[PDB]
Amino acid sequence: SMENFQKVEKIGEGTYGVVYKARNKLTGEVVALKKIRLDTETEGVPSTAIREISLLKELNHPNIVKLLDVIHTENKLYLVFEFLHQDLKTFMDASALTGIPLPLIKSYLFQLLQGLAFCHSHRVLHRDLKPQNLLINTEGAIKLADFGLARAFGVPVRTYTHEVVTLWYRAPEILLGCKYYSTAVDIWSLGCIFAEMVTRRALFPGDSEIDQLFRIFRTLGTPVVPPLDEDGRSLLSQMLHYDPNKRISAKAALAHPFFQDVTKPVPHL
Amino acid sequence: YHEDIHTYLREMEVKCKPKVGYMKKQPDITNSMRAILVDWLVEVGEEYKLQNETLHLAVNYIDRFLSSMSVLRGKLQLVGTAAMLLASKFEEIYPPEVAEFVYITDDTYTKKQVLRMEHLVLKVLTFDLAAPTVNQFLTQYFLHQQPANCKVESLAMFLGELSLIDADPYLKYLPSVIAGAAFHLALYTVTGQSWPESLIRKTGYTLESLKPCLMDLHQTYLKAPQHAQQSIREKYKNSKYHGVSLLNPPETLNL
Ligand SMILES: NS(=O)(=O)c1ccc(Nc2nc(OCC3CCCCC3)c3nc[nH]c3n2)cc1
Numbered sequence A: 001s002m003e004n005f006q007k008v009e010k011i012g013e014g015t016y017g018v019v020y021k022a023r024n025k026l027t028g029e030v031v032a033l034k035k036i037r038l039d040t041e042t043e044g045v046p047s048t049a050i051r052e053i054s055l056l057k058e059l060n061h062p063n064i065v066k067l068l069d070v071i072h073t074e075n076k077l078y079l080v081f082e083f084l085h086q087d088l089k090t091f092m093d094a095s096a097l098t099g100i101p102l103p104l105i106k107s108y109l110f111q112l113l114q115g116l117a118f119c120h121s122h123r124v125l126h127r128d129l130k131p132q133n134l135l136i137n138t139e140g141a142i143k144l145a146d147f148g149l150a151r152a153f154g155v156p157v158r159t160y161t162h163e164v165v166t167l168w169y170r171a172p173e174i175l176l177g178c179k180y181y182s183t184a185v186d187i188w189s190l191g192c193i194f195a196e197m198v199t200r201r202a203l204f205p206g207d208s209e210i211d212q213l214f215r216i217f218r219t220l221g222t223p224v225v226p227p228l229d230e231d232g233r234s235l236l237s238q239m240l241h242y243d244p245n246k247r248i249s250a251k252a253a254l255a256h257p258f259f260q261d262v263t264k265p266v267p268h269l
Numbered sequence B: 001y002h003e004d005i006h007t008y009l010r011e012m013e014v015k016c017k018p019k020v021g022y023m024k025k026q027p028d029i030t031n032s033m034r035a036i037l038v039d040w041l042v043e044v045g046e047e048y049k050l051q052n053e054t055l056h057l058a059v060n061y062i063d064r065f066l067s068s069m070s071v072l073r074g075k076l077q078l079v080g081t082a083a084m085l086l087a088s089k090f091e092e093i094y095p096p097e098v099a100e101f102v103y104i105t106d107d108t109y110t111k112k113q114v115l116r117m118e119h120l121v122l123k124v125l126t127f128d129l130a131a132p133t134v135n136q137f138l139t140q141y142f143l144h145q146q147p148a149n150c151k152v153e154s155l156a157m158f159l160g161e162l163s164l165i166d167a168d169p170y171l172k173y174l175p176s177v178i179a180g181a182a183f184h185l186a187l188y189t190v191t192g193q194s195w196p197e198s199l200i201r202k203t204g205y206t207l208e209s210l211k212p213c214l215m216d217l218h219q220t221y222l223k224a225p226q227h228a229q230q231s232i233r234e235k236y237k238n239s240k241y242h243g244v245s246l247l248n249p250p251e252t253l254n255l
């Protein structure tokens, strides 16, 4: 089963399981392996694994991480993914003193919205957009990862799980416990990440739910990013609109004048 | 994304479609046994207050599993139990725990059997669980009401559920078509309106193109009291669904 894979190093722990860097001994391919324990006497295959796998098998896009294989054993499930060289959070930290060039920020946002628009047009909400879950390679690409908190949504949506999105990236409609939420929640997260790429610090780093809400109302007003030009500010304000319906969709965001001159720069690693 | 999503589900319903003739290739089980199973699942869905979507998913999984795996009749309920458990994990905010599924089989099966079947079903379906359902198309169609009528919505939902019971004829029809026939019949029964213009534009389905499925579902509605399986009728008598099953079907459609 796993005979052909040599573990190189442990990468981290996401919503569930553990991710390792591994190499295929026969092809030379370097992969990320997600190891998933199965509760064989109690609860079985976790719902997070069921959702991530079923949905990732549908979502084939350049800006969504590729699931290559699922390896079954009696007691473990291993997901074989393409390996990306590092996460956006690590990149930003390494760039804390020198900053990230605007052409790169713009390219990254463009690609993320492409991946997100693909998700949303395929009735999938990600629900965990944070720089830790966004992976970059040495050739200018960025991709959506860790679909452990994702789900398939209905048209129209019904009430879904409230315990969703890390605090810092959580949209006002979640923080106020609105009955319904949808695709707008992911755009909010992306709006926060856009701001964080430009400053290299989190936009709304709340210490609690109330602190989170106050930080949002402080910055936006009751229902920002100096290095950013007029085109950038306009897009950012549309991604951080208070009203979920008024908040821009990923599709419409791609047609924004901010992206008129977007290229694909290679990052500095 | 309402149009993008609709298009995608129309594509997916073809890929996720079970084998039409499969029960003929099953040596130990029949359509009558599948009816018994699907009815019991309706009961399960009621005891645990599951989403209607969950029940529709569970049925898709069972039909697809039985399309490729021969199953003896003593193990048929085991397949169904595992399918409902998988659908619950996929769709529910708070799915019942495994022990609750073992309890409802009245201790015919062990918890180890249920969990081992869960894994077998995942393997056979190759984890492809995000299937389009009648319920999914219906929720979309309800948006084309003017005005919204929860008697109509509940009765379409009722008729859509009746189709799950009978593999013959309903295996040969797509979720989108069944949802089309159910919505027209519910709309007509309650108000007297027909399949809306805006829904033809959306779906490409006309009342003539929905006709064969409409004829079957019309008959299914008229003879529903005499069906061996009565759980869906009993469910839809409750004020939760506004007692839509207590209504009299139209004698005709004038199609
Ligand atoms: N920290 S880091 O900068 O040293 C570094 C980061 C991530 C990776 N690579 C990588 N990681 C994944 O998820 C692991 C990660 C995601 C969720 C949070 C915990 C763990 C993948 N999933 C498919 N392919 C993947 N590739 C390499 C180096």
Ligand SMILES: [Mg+2]
Pocket (backbone or CB within 6 Å): B023, B024, B025, B026, B027, B028, B029, B030
């Ligand atoms: Mg047979």
